[PDB]
Amino acid sequence: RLPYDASKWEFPRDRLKLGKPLGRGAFGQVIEADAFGIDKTATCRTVAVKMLKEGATHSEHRALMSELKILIHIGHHLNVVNLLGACTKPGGPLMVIVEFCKFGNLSTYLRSKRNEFVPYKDFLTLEHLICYSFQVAKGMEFLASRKCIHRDLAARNILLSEKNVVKICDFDIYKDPDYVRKGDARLPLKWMAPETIFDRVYTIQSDVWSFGVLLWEIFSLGASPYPGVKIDEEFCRRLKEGTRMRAPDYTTPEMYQTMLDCWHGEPSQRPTFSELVEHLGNLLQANAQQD
Ligand SMILES: COC(=O)c1ccc2c(c1)NC(=O)/C2=C(\Nc1ccc(N(C)C(=O)CN2CCN(C)CC2)cc1)c1ccccc1
């Protein structure tokens, strides 16, 4: 759609060697791959490649090329999943090469660390959890500055790479039910602000609500929000009137206070991601203080 600077972005297909799919979805697939020299050094880096499936409608091609263009628009930040390059020229498939985050989505990761957590000292600790939280806030402050709205901020959509760096991704009902297991899905409604459940309107301050739900997910070590409750039209009703989740098993009091601040029923009275970054950095620095 928008102009495309091939000098900056085009990567040669003959320096890309595809491996196995990391995941396959309704509209495309993400393949694990090796790229030679994509960061301008003389190195092989494992990257992830968004590309189409073998079916592939012109609407599915147009969408990937739109995502590529939007990624170029957003630009780089440590705490988003970054565009590394693309292959768009005649001679092969459309491929959008992005950062590989080896540990996978954060929800699944945290659930896997439940017998490997200690509040403070290999293991996860409060330091890790407030870190992940600050990093997602830093990531979202950046996206707000690019005038983006995420619309589906959840711990499933946060990826973990090396050195406890965590990165926001914008992507089940899809996957083959013969192969579907217990947490292989998530009900997005549980992350939606009252004004979005109800009026279907997305803003950056509705993303601040979902960030609160994400915080809850981090500090439950990857449990599902609203435990027990069935999500009917009275869930909604109660939600719009003031009902909120209880503190999860691994929260500190300050972090639970922050969830509740992010769940202000009134969008303008929720913290901004700039205010969350400042407050969460304070909490992070306090946590590792000494005597
Ligand atoms: C805009 O950018 C994007 O949109 C985007 C989207 C997805 C990913 C991405 C960028 N970048 C990644 O890394 C992604 C995934 N990554 C992944 C990583 C590790 C795993 N895990 C834990 C494995 O075990 C995989 N394992 C395979 C074998 N080799 C040897 C090692 C890695 C699984 C998925 C992933 C993709 C599909 C769905 C879930 C996540």
Tell which residue, 132, 103, 94, 130, has the closest CA to residue 251: 130
d(CA 102, CA 47): 10
**How far is Cα 56 from Cα 162, in angstroms, rounded to an integer?**
33
Nearest by Cα to 193 from 174, 207, 180, 181 = 207
In 10 A of CB 118, how many CB atoms? 10
Residue with CA nearest ligand 1 atom 3: 169
d(CA 156, CA 139): 15
Which strands form 95-99's sheet, in the order they lie side by side? 16-24, 29-36, 44-51, 95-99, 83-87
Q: Is 258 in the pocket of ligand 1 (CB under 6 A)?
A: no
Q: Are 175 and 182 in contact (CB under 8 A)?
A: no
Residue 159 Cα to ligand 1 middle (Å): 8
C-alpha–C-alpha distance, residues 152 and 221, integer Å: 19
- Taking the C-alpha atoms of residue 138 and residue 278, their distance in angstroms, rounded to an integer, is 9
Pick the atom of ligand 1 nearest to 101's CA.
13
Segments of the chain assigned to CATH 1.10.510.10: 101-286
Which numbered atom of ligand 1 lies nearest the CA of 100?
13
Q: Which of 30, 97, 99, 167 to mutate to test the pocket of ligand 1 (most atoms within 8 A of CB)?
A: 30
Solved by what technique?
X-ray
Distance 99 CA to ligand 1 centre (A): 9
Please choose, from the candidates 140, 238, 256, 143, the residue with its C-alpha nearest in 3D space to the C-alpha of residue 198.
238
**Residues designated as active site:** 152
| CATH number for region 101-286 | 1.10.510.10
What's the per-residue H, E or C state across the chain? CCCCCHHHHECCHHHEEEEEEEEECCCCEEEEEEEECCCCCCCEEEEEEEECCCCCCHHHHHHHHHHHHHHHHHCCCCCECCEEEEECCCCCCCEEEEECCCCEEHHHHHHCCHHHECCCCCCECHHHHHHHHHHHHHHHHHHHHCCCCCCCCCHHHEEECHHHCEEECCCCCCCCCCCCCCCCCCCHHHHCCHHHHHHCCCCHHHHHHHHHHHHHHHHCCCCCCCCCCCCCHHHHHHHHHCCCCCCCCCCCHHHHHHHHHHCCCCHHHCCCHHHHHHHHHHHHHHHCCCC
> Structure resolution in Å?
2.1
| Class in CATH terms, 1-100 | alpha beta
Considering the chain, tell me which residue range(s) the CATH 3.30.200.20 domain(s) occupy.
Answer: 1-100
**Residue positions forming the annotated binding site for ATP:** 22-30, 50
Residue 63: exposed, middle, or buried by beta-carbon count in 10 A (0-12, 13-18, 19+)? middle
Atom 16, ligand 1: residue with shortest CA distance: 104
Dihedral over alpha carbons 114, 115, 121, 123 (to 10 degrees): -70
Cβ atoms within 10 Å of 103's Cβ, excluding its own = 15
